[PDB]
Paper text:
We synthesized a 2′-fluoro-substituted stable mimic of DHU (FDHU), which allows binding but not catalysis by [name]. In light of the observation that different [name]–DNA interaction modes are largely resulted from the conformation changes of the lesion recognition loop, we chose to modify the potential key amino acids on this loop. In order to destabilize the quarantine state, we rationally designed [name]([name], G249P) and [name]([name], [name]) to disrupt the flexibility of the loop or the aromatic stacking interactions respectively. Instead of the quarantine state originally observed in [name]([name])–FDHU structure, we found that both two mutants switched to the activated state as expected. Our study reveals that instead of utilizing a specific pocket to tightly recognize a flipped base via extensive electrostatic and hydrogen bonding interactions, [name] uses two competing interaction states to achieve substrate recognition. This mechanism is further corroborated by our finding that the relative dominance of the competing interaction states can be manipulated by artificially introduced or naturally existing mutations to the key lesion recognition loop.
Numbering used by the authors: 2 to 202, 222 to 244, 250 to 290
The structure:
Amino acid sequence: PEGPELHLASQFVNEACRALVFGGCVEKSSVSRNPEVPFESSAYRISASARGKELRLILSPLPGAQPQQEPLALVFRFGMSGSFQLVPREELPRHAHLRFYTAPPGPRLALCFVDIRRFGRWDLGGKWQPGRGPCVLQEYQQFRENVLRNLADKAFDRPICEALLDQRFFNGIGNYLRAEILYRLKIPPFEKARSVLEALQNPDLLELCHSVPKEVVQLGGRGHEEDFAAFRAWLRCYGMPGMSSLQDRHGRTIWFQGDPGPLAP
DNA sequence: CGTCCAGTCTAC
DNA sequence: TAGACCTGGACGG
């Protein structure tokens, strides 16, 4: 999951939970090393927002709910396999690590944070990760300014393909988006980042960091096989036949067409 | 059967 | 940095 998946997971939670009232506790699986959520309320609503590669749930007790409680915020990072599902309460998928249970009246559902590989994390504060830069989807101008004012940072000494994964400057960009973004401008992935960015100090690389991920959000879906076909068809570069690939300095595969670029392994 | 492949996080 | 953290599907023998 990259920026577009975190955003669509947000839209899912807001849409699927619009007319739902939750009750009881927040249940963690016994194998999750993430923290217990100390929250009980007889009647609460769940809402969400995304920022880059993080998602924030707000748990909002209704007027008079008991025990007395203030709203609680949780922030999620999805790692390699995180997702939200709404399922029947007795049809929990495998690897449902955190569960929110609908109160009656109506079909007993669970909203589940599902994470096969368990690289996903949640924190009890409502706070975004300190050090992550602005959202490329929802805070474009702040994102763009934060890169252009910090080109002296040693992060920009690196290949552009490596710099695009650094969540201090490109919060929301992951391995498929870096390939798609670089393929549209035919920028060699191992061109130095500072060269490509001082050059833009006909959409430029920073506009595409916003508009390419926006295109994925516009497809819709992502699971929550027919929209998996839509995604595969949208991809022009990542994993595609006739495309080159190399390992970057952290062993992550960059897909590209043509010239690997000057700092290539 | 086995190998290989798919975002942080933190000891060195 | 390198290895760690994890499960499962595709594919080879």
